[PDB]
Subunit: 115 residues, 4 copies
């Protein structure tokens, strides 16, 4: 039923600078993979920390009971989008235990060992 | 002997191309493992039974899982490993070599 | 007032040799309300540990530290396997990418 | 003045046709004993080795030979024990 905990911290965080186009496959698709094996919906709140400015408010998001959910940091926008080419860190909190795992590059980038 | 590890483990990442779970049972009692696969859009897929004998290790390829059903490829999943006795569970996602020598193969 | 993390961390691995490439970095987070006075110690396989590398991580702030940028007491010999111990007066969260995984990712990334 | 613990386990192990990085930030030498586990046969005796006080030490599994060398192209696992706390990391 309830595996994991309600508070996770990720000291690393970085979205490489790109142009005004769609982020490239050769870039840090830094994602936060979350699992909620529980029977109650997980109301996740993410806080981003920086090296020079104050923390950016609660980024709400939900992870349905008995479900997983990958969250690209780049896709975060409310309250605000994360400044690219900036070192950040994050804290993930939930009402129910969840399992969190940071990935610097998602699954389908590794799917390129094909040559 | 040793009863290292725990009876419950969770792996948030899981993805098969068109990953292995390494388990160690340093204990004296056989480990009756039950694996549950979670998805992002559908309900969990039933208990995948398996056994890890006492004082033995065992590498389980997720692709080799088939009963209740095979794991859909090109699909992001997650898993929960449970045992009656403490076991040590580990997962490696990015093969250092196969990645380091794929670059060479430009 | 997130008093998350602990006052002591250790990294068994350590090794110094575009933009999308990462390297020997120690990312630290201090979600607390008190400034973090971090002290890093570097260990080697053949010589004694190199003194306290002081550094500060302000309350409610993060901070990435390149091992290469460490210089006082002294710079870390490149092409040398080392390890480190990070201590603080207040709880901090410390994260480092396992050398192998790092090199590997950069390999896949490089690959056009 | 010690970090880490006296026991570590590694579920993965494989030498194709892997290094254990240890750190001993303590003031007492660490007498490490490694046990290799397999999927079909019993565990292979104590592989002794020492990690000097305030020192690190990388140990290639391939370099292990006493009691015996580790069969290549074979999936194995290991348990690392010490008389004093050490920090271990598989690579």
């Amino acid at each position: 039923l309830s595996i994991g905990r309600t508070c996770w911290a990720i000291a690393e965080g970085y979205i490489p600078p790109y142009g005004n186009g769609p982020e490239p496959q050769f870039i840090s698709h830094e994602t936060v993979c979350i699992l909620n094996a529980g029977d109650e919906d997980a109301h996740v709140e993410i806080t981003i920390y920086y090296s020079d400015k104050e923390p950016v408010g609660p980024y709400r998001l939900t992870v349905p009971a008995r479900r997983t959910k990958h969250v690209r940091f780049n896709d975060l926008n409310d309250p605000a989008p994360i400044p690219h080419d900036t070192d950040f860190a994050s804290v993930i909190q939930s009402n129910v235990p969840i399992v969190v795992q940071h990935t610097r590059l998602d699954s389908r980038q590794a799917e390129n060992a094909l040559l």
